Ligand binder design. Structure first.
Ligand SMILES: Clc1ncc(NCc2ccccc2)cc1-c1cccc2ncccc12
Ligand SMILES: Clc1ncc(NCc2ccccc2)cc1-c1cccc2ncccc12
Lengths: 94, 92
């Protein structure tokens, strides 16, 4: 316990941004990515299913009000967020 | 003033991507967490169907704003989490 005071439009695996809001959380608003397509954009600008768009996830630190509905008392929490998309081969080498 | 009660690589996307990336160690002993693993794109370009680097396309890092604790105050920093492939800006 302590005291405390456009490029994605040009991607071959493009995404949209989605508002993730939670007043019981700091930061209250987190911008999450959702891939537009299951395939990737090929050279003619069409979705190609020989490759797949996949979201990249990241574990983010967050402050959660503890106990519920407290203006100045928080607990440190980790959550998983989608930060963007990449284009991958659908097969795995494992 | 508020009261606060107090790295791995588990996905294979980094290697399966047309914009693959490596991880670099970002360490700060007066910070929580002290170690963060940041992505860096492997190539300037992206991998084509033949397995070769296409220098016309661009590999670019995906950044995310994250919360860290510094010796105790709260700070927001930007971190690279992966890379995507984009078509370049080719007009004014
Ligand atoms: Cl410009 C382009 N070039 C290649 C690809 N995918 C193929 C590829 C990926 C990696 C390495 C080699 C080749 C896609 C696009 C592309 C992206 C976004 C919008 C587009 N709108 C119209 C036309 C193309 C678009
Ligand atoms: Cl399998 C493959 N297929 C297509 C691409 N990029 C072209 C493309 C992108 C988007 C839409 C259409 C076409 C790249 C790869 C590829 C990716 C990763 C490693 C590889 N290692 C060897 C050979 C290919 C590899």
């Amino acid at each position: 316990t302590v005291m405390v005071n456009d490029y994605y439009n040009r991607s071959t695996s493009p995404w949209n941004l989605h508002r993730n809001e939670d007043p019981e959380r700091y930061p209250s608003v987190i911008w999450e990515a959702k891939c537009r397509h299951l395939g990737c954009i090929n050279a003619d600008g069409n979705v190609d299913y020989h490759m797949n768009s996949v979201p990249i996830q990241q574990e983010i630190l967050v402050l959660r009000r503890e106990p519920p509905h407290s203006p100045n008392s928080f607990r440190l929490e980790k959550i998983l967020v989608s930060v963007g998309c990449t284009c991958v081969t659908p097969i795995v080498h494992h």
